[PDB]
Amino acid sequence: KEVDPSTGELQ
Amino acid sequence: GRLIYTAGGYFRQSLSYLEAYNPSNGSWLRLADLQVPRSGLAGCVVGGLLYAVGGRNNSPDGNTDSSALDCYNPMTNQWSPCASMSVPRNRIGVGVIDGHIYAVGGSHGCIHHSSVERYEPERDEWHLVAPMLTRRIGVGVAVLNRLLYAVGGFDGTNRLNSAECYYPERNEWRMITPMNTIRSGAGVCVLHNCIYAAGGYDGQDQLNSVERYDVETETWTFVAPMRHHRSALGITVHQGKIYVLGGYDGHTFLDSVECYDPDSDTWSEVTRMTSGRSGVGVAVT
């Protein structure tokens, strides 16, 4: 899945 | 004997926990859940009360931006809503001066705020103050000599290394020396007479480095780096030490809590949270 690299969160 | 409180965060989705670590005996408390799960919020304390500000509820079936302010009384182990911000603010930064809460920056969908607002508890009210010089999300905030420093973040295009200083008596902002390293989702606090910025993400790698600003030298100096690279961590100071809680490191969610001893410029692991998470609001009381 795609994850915001600075927080780990999805989408 | 005051505690380190940790509120919300994110693991598989945004969390709603409130837990507290007692550094003098190593125990964790399981306190009351937040009303609404949230990550990328910030925490602060005003007159013995803990407040959770902004964030987002990134659930499995879509995410909502929070403009909410909630207050927890360690006495009643209860949250209570307070007036909401003028605007939803995810990945907000927060500092306190004169028992007034400054809500700085954050996001609302595509909107990257430069706006700042102030909360007066004695009358449950938010007031727009002067906007910052740059739009900033994932911004670290630190209060020093009755001034507020905004550090790092992301402007809606670039991950920043710049930093500004707010002057509440004059209601104006000024840029200061940029950081050595660019930092999104760093933890920012104040120990002794310096602003620290630890970890974050520089556009390529999640960092373990820690630099501090000196107000008189206007220069940033790296100090001992952390053991574990982390971004969207929680930070605070408890009795002359910096504590960093969890974060994301490009791979997993950390449950690790490191402590920084300024005398001896070393870091160590002092405990683990009950579960790894990032984007928590942290404060002490």
Contact A8 B232 (CB under 8 A): yes
Find the CB nearest A7 among B10, B63, B159. B10
State the resolution, in angstroms: 2.6
Say yes or no for a CB contact (<8 Å) between A6 and B250: no
- Give the closest residue to B67 by CA, choosing from B81, B79, B80, B48: B81
Experimental method: X-ray
| Cα B151-B58-B18 angle, rounded to 5 deg | 75
Using alpha carbons only, give the angle B64, B68, B70 rounded to the nearest 5 degrees. Answer: 130
> Beta B42-46 vs B147-154: how paired, if at all?
unpaired
Please list, residue by residue across B145-183, b when 16 or more beta carbons sit within 10 angstroms of its beta carbon and e when fewer do. eebbbbbbbbbeeebbbbbbbbebeeeebeebeebebbb
C-alpha radius of gyration, chain B, whole number: 17
- Residue B248 to residue A7, Cβ atoms within 8 A: yes
Write out the residues of chain B at the interface with chain A, using a CB-CB cutoff of 8 A.
10, 39-40, 58, 63, 91, 138, 154, 159, 184-185, 200-201, 206, 231-232, 248, 250, 253, 278-279
Mutate to test the interface with B, among A1, A4, A7 (most CBs of B within 10 A): A7
CA distances from B39 to B7, B42, B257, B271 (A): 8, 9, 18, 21
CB contact, 8 Å: A1 with chain B?
A: no
How many C-beta neighbours within 10 Å does residue B28 have?
16
**Are B47 and B63 a contacting pair, CB within 8 Å?**
no
The answer to whether the beta carbons of residues B118 and B130 sit under 8 Å apart is no
Closest CA to B279 of B231, B209, B243: B231
Q: What is the DSSP letter of B123?
A: G
Strand partners, B155: none
Which CATH fold topology does B1-285 show?
A: Neuraminidase (2.120.10)
In three-state secondary structure terms, B121 is: helix
